[PDB]
Design a protein around this ligand. Sequence first.
Ligand SMILES: CCCCC/C=C/C/C=C\C/C=C/C/C=C/CCCC(=O)O[C@@H](COC(=O)CCCCCCCCCCCCCCCCC)COP(=O)(O)O[C@@H]1[C@H](O)[C@H](O)[C@H](OP(=O)(O)O)[C@@H](OP(=O)(O)O)[C@H]1O
Ligand SMILES: CCCCC/C=C/C/C=C\C/C=C/C/C=C/CCCC(=O)O[C@@H](COC(=O)CCCCCCCCCCCCCCCCC)COP(=O)(O)O[C@@H]1[C@H](O)[C@H](O)[C@H](OP(=O)(O)O)[C@@H](OP(=O)(O)O)[C@H]1O
Ligand SMILES: CS(=O)(=O)Nc1ccc(C(=O)NCc2ccc(Cl)cc2Cl)cc1
Ligand SMILES: CS(=O)(=O)Nc1ccc(C(=O)NCc2ccc(Cl)cc2Cl)cc1
Ligand SMILES: CCCCCCCO[C@@H]1O[C@H](CO)[C@@H](O)[C@H](O)[C@H]1O
Ligand SMILES: CCCCCCCO[C@@H]1O[C@H](CO)[C@@H](O)[C@H](O)[C@H]1O
Ligand SMILES: CCCCCCCO[C@@H]1O[C@H](CO)[C@@H](O)[C@H](O)[C@H]1O
Ligand SMILES: CCCCCCCO[C@@H]1O[C@H](CO)[C@@H](O)[C@H](O)[C@H]1O
Ligand SMILES: CCCCCCCCCCCCCCCC
Ligand SMILES: CCCCCCCCCCCCCCCC
Ligand SMILES: CCCCCCCCCCCCCCCC
Ligand SMILES: CCCCCCCCCCC(=O)O
Ligand SMILES: CCCCCCCCCCC(=O)O
Ligand SMILES: CCCCCCCCCCCC
Ligand SMILES: CCCCCCCCCCCC
Ligand SMILES: CCCCCCCCCCC
Ligand SMILES: CCCCCCCC
Ligand SMILES: CCCCCCCC
Ligand SMILES: CCCCC
Ligand SMILES: [K+]
Ligand SMILES: [K+]
Ligand SMILES: [K+]
Ligand SMILES: [K+]
Ligand SMILES: [K+]
Ligand SMILES: [K+]
Lengths: 276, 281
Amino acid sequence: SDSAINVMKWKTVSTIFLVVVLYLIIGATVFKALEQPQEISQRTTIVIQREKFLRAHPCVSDQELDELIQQIVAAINAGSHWDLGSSFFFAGTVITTIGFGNISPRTEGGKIFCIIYALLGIPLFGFLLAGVGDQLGTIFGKGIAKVEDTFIKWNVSQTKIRIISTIIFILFGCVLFVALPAVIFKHIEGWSALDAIYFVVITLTTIGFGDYVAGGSDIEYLDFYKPVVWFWILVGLAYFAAVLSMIGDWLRVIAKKTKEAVGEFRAHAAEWTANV
Amino acid sequence: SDSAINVMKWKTVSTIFLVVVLYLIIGATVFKALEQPQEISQRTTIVIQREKFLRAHPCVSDQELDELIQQIVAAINAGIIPLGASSNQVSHWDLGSSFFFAGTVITTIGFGNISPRTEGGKIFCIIYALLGIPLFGFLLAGVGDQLGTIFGKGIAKVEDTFIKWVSQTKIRIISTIIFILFGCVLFVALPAVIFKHIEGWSALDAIYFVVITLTTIGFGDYVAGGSDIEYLDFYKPVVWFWILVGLAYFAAVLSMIGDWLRVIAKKTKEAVGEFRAHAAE
Ligand SMILES: CCCCC/C=C/C/C=C\C/C=C/C/C=C/CCCC(=O)O[C@@H](COC(=O)CCCCCCCCCCCCCCCCC)COP(=O)(O)O[C@@H]1[C@H](O)[C@H](O)[C@H](OP(=O)(O)O)[C@@H](OP(=O)(O)O)[C@H]1O
Ligand SMILES: CCCCC/C=C/C/C=C\C/C=C/C/C=C/CCCC(=O)O[C@@H](COC(=O)CCCCCCCCCCCCCCCCC)COP(=O)(O)O[C@@H]1[C@H](O)[C@H](O)[C@H](OP(=O)(O)O)[C@@H](OP(=O)(O)O)[C@H]1O
Ligand SMILES: CS(=O)(=O)Nc1ccc(C(=O)NCc2ccc(Cl)cc2Cl)cc1
Ligand SMILES: CS(=O)(=O)Nc1ccc(C(=O)NCc2ccc(Cl)cc2Cl)cc1
Ligand SMILES: CCCCCCCO[C@@H]1O[C@H](CO)[C@@H](O)[C@H](O)[C@H]1O
Ligand SMILES: CCCCCCCO[C@@H]1O[C@H](CO)[C@@H](O)[C@H](O)[C@H]1O
Ligand SMILES: CCCCCCCO[C@@H]1O[C@H](CO)[C@@H](O)[C@H](O)[C@H]1O
Ligand SMILES: CCCCCCCO[C@@H]1O[C@H](CO)[C@@H](O)[C@H](O)[C@H]1O
Ligand SMILES: CCCCCCCCCCCCCCCC
Ligand SMILES: CCCCCCCCCCCCCCCC
Ligand SMILES: CCCCCCCCCCCCCCCC
Ligand SMILES: CCCCCCCCCCC(=O)O
Ligand SMILES: CCCCCCCCCCC(=O)O
Ligand SMILES: CCCCCCCCCCCC
Ligand SMILES: CCCCCCCCCCCC
Ligand SMILES: CCCCCCCCCCC
Ligand SMILES: CCCCCCCC
Ligand SMILES: CCCCCCCC
Ligand SMILES: CCCCC
Ligand SMILES: [K+]
Ligand SMILES: [K+]
Ligand SMILES: [K+]
Ligand SMILES: [K+]
Ligand SMILES: [K+]
Ligand SMILES: [K+]
C-alpha cells in the first residue's frame, strides 16, 4: 500500500500543523496581552500632544496640521539612503534574507532588479554560508577533541559528556556571537542591553524586523565597525543556523518522549480501569 | 589526509566568498544607479514643500517643527493616524493582527510593520522565535513532502502519455519545466492577480510582494491584509494557506537554482581552464 505510508505521512503533517496553529494562538494572546496596553497609552498621549501643539502654537490653524501630517506620512514612503555603502548594505539584506526594510526599492526597475538579484543571490549566499559553517564546524570539533580527552581521563564517562559538549557550544557561542557583539552595539549605537540582544536575535535568526539596524543612525562610526558587523553577520548566521538546527533535534526528542509518556499514561490508566 | 580535504575546502570557501563580495559590489552599483536619482528629486521637493509651511507660519518656533516631525515619525513606527477627521481607530495588536505578527516571527518573513515595543514583548519574541522557527520548519518540511508526492503522481501520468519514439535523463528536463510553469501560475501569478484587485497594488508591486514574501526577505514595504480596507475574511485565511505552500515551493525553487549554479560553476571552471591551456596557440 503506497496510500498507507501517505496516510501515515498526512497524519503526522496534520498533527504538526495543529501544534503550529496552537503555537500561533498562544503567541497571539501573549503578544496582545503585552502590547495592546502600550498601544493605548501611546495613542492617548499622541492625542494629548496633538491638542497641546494646536494651543501652545496658536499660529497654526487646525486644518493645516492635517496637511502637514499628510506631507510627513507621504514622505515616510521615501525618507542619502542610496550611497554606495548603504546600497551595499541593502544588497546584503537581500541575499541573507535578513531584509531589514529601512531601505527598499521605490522604482519599477529597482523592484525588477531586486527580484532577479534575490533569486540568484539567495542561493549563492547559501553556498558561502554553508562553507563558513563547515569551517566553524572543524574549529569547534578540534576544541572538543581536546575537552573529551582532558575530561575523559578522570570523571563521569560516556554519553553524559555529549551533554557537556553541547553546553560549551551554547555558552562559548553566546559569548562570541550574542553577548560580545551586544556589548559593542550598546556602546556604539546607544541601545539598551535588551534592545541589543533583541537586535542580535532578530538579525541572526533572519527575522529582521528593522526596528533596530546596526550602522543605521546618523552617528559617526569608525569604519572598522561596519566591516566587523559584516563579519559578525557571516559567522553569526552560521552559528544561529546550527543552534536553530539543534533546537529542532531537541523537539524531535521531546516529541518521542511525550508520545511515550502519553502511551504510559494510557497503559496504566487502562489496567487500573480493567481492575476497576 | 584529514587536513587535505579541509585545505581543498577552505580553498573553495575563499573563492565563493570573493564571488559573493563581487556580487554585492555589482548589486550596490546597480541599486544606487536605480534609486539615488529619485531620492534626490524627492529630497529637493520635500525641502520645497518645507519652505511653503516654514515661513507661511513664522510664529511657530521652527526648530520646534523638527521636534514635531520627530514625534510624528517616531509614532508612525507604532502606527498612529494622528488626525481629528479620523481620531477613532482599529488596533494593531488585536488577536488577528497579533496572530499575523506571530506568523512573521516563526516564518522569519518578519515584515516589521508591527513589532514589540515593550521590554517583555521583546523578551517573549526572542523565546518565541528560538522555539518557533524550528517548529515551523518541521511543518514546512512536511508541507513540502505533501506537494512532492502530489506533483510526483502527476508526472507519472505525464511521463506515461509522453512515451513516444524519449530517454531516462531527457524527461527530467520536461518535468522541471512543468514544475516552474505550474508553480509560477499557482504560487506567483494567480495570487498576484488577487492581490492587485484586493489591495489595489500594481501588477509589478504584487509580484514584488510575492517574491519578497516567499523568499522570506520580507522588507515590509507591502503587506497583504495591511490596510484598513474591508476584507472578506475568506481572504486572510487563503493568504495564510498561500504562505504555507508558497514558502515550500520557493524553498524548492531556490534549491533548484542552487543546483544550476553548482553546474554553471563546474563549467566556468573548465572554460577558464581551457582558456588558460590554449592561450592563443
Ligand atoms: C524552556 C522555556 C519554557 C517554555 C515552555 C516550553 C514548552 C516545551 C517546548 C516547546 C513546546 C513543545 C514543542 C514540541 C511539541 C511537543 C508536543 C508533542 C510532540 C509533538 O509535537 O507532536 C507529536 C506527539 O503528540 C501527542 O502525542 C499528543 C500531544 C500533543 C499536545 C502535547 C502538549 C503540547 C501542548 C502544550 C505545550 C506546547 C504549546 C506551545 C507552548 C508555547 C510556549 C510559548 C505528534 O507528532 P509526531 O510527528 O511526533 O508523530 C510521530 C513521530 O514524529 C515519529 O518519529 C514519525 O516521524 P518524524 O516526525 O520523526 O519525522 C512520525 O511519522 P510516522 O511514523 O507516522 O510515519 C510519527 O509516528
Ligand atoms: C536573466 C538574468 C541573468 C543575468 C546574467 C548573469 C549571469 C551570471 C548569473 C549569476 C551569477 C553568476 C553565475 C556564474 C557563476 C559564478 C560562480 C563562479 C564559479 C566559481 O565559484 O569558481 C569556479 C571557477 O571559476 C574560476 O576559475 C575563477 C572565475 C571567477 C569569476 C568568474 C565570473 C564570476 C564573477 C563575475 C560574473 C558574475 C558576477 C555577478 C553578476 C551580477 C548579476 C546580477 C570554481 O568553483 P569553486 O572552487 O569556487 O567551488 C565550487 C563552486 O563554488 C560551486 O558552484 C559551489 O558553489 P557556487 O559558487 O556555485 O555558489 C561549490 O560547492 P561545494 O563543492 O563546495 O559543495 C564548489 O563546488
Ligand atoms: C539605513 S542607512 O541608510 O543608514 N544605511 C546603512 C545601514 C547599515 C549599514 C551597515 O553596513 N550595517 C552593518 C550591516 C551589514 C550588512 C548587513 Cl546584511 C546588515 C548590517 Cl546591520 C550601512 C548603511
Ligand atoms: C496591517 S496590521 O499590521 O495592522 N494587521 C494585519 C496585517 C496583516 C494580516 C494578515 O493576516 N496577512 C496575511 C498573512 C498571514 C500570515 C503571514 Cl506570516 C503573512 C501574511 Cl501577509 C493580518 C493583520
Ligand atoms: C474542503 C474539502 C476538501 C477535501 C480535500 C481532501 C482532503 O483529504 C486530504 O487531502 C490531501 C491533499 O491532497 C491528501 O494528500 C490527503 O491524503 C487527504 O487526507
Ligand atoms: C568595546 C567598546 C567599543 C566602543 C568604543 C567607543 C568609543 O567612542 C567614541 O567616542 C568619540 C568621541 O570622542 C566618538 O566621536 C566616536 O564616534 C566613538 O566611537
Ligand atoms: C594563477 C592562479 C589562479 C588564480 C585565479 C583566481 C581565482 O582563484 C582561484 O580559483 C580556483 C578555481 O579555478 C580556486 O578554486 C582556487 O583555489 C583559487 O586559487
Ligand atoms: C558557460 C560560461 C559562463 C560564463 C563564464 C565565462 C568566463 O570567461 C571570463 O572569465 C574572466 C575571469 O578571468 C572574467 O573576467 C570574465 O568576465 C568572464 O566572461
Ligand atoms: C522598467 C525599467 C526596467 C529597468 C531594467 C533593469 C534591469 C537592469 C539589469 C542589469 C543587468 C546587469 C548585467 C550584468 C551581468 C553580467
Ligand atoms: C581565529 C579563529 C576564528 C575567530 C572567530 C571569531 C572570533 C571573534 C568573535 C566575533 C567578533 C565580532 C563581534 C563584534 C561585532 C560588532
Ligand atoms: C508587468 C511588469 C513586468 C515585470 C514582471 C517581471 C518579469 C521579469 C521577472 C524576472 C524573470 C527572470 C528570472 C531569472 C531567473 C534567474
Ligand atoms: C569579512 C570582512 C568584511 C568583508 C566586507 C567588507 C566591506 C566593508 C564595507 C563597509 C561599508 O558598508 O561601508
Ligand atoms: C497556519 C494556518 C492558520 C490559519 C488560521 C485562520 C485564521 C485567519 C485569521 C483571520 C482574521 O484574523 O480575520
Ligand atoms: C538585561 C538582560 C536581558 C535578558 C535577556 C534574556 C533572554 C531570554 C533568556 C532565555 C533564552 C531562551
Ligand atoms: C489546488 C488547491 C489550491 C492551490 C493553491 C491555492 C493558493 C493560491 C491562493 C492565493 C490567495 C491570495
Ligand atoms: C505579466 C506577468 C508575467 C509573470 C511572470 C512571473 C515570473 C515569476 C518568476 C519566478 C521564478
Ligand atoms: C518586564 C517584564 C519582562 C518579563 C516578561 C516575561 C514574558 C514571558
Ligand atoms: C534536469 C535538467 C533540467 C533542465 C533545466 C533547464 C530548464 C529551464
Ligand atoms: C528539517 C527540520 C527543521 C528544523 C529547523
Ligand atoms: K533562510
Ligand atoms: K528570513
Ligand atoms: K526576513
Ligand atoms: K522588515
Ligand atoms: K516597515
Ligand atoms: K524581514
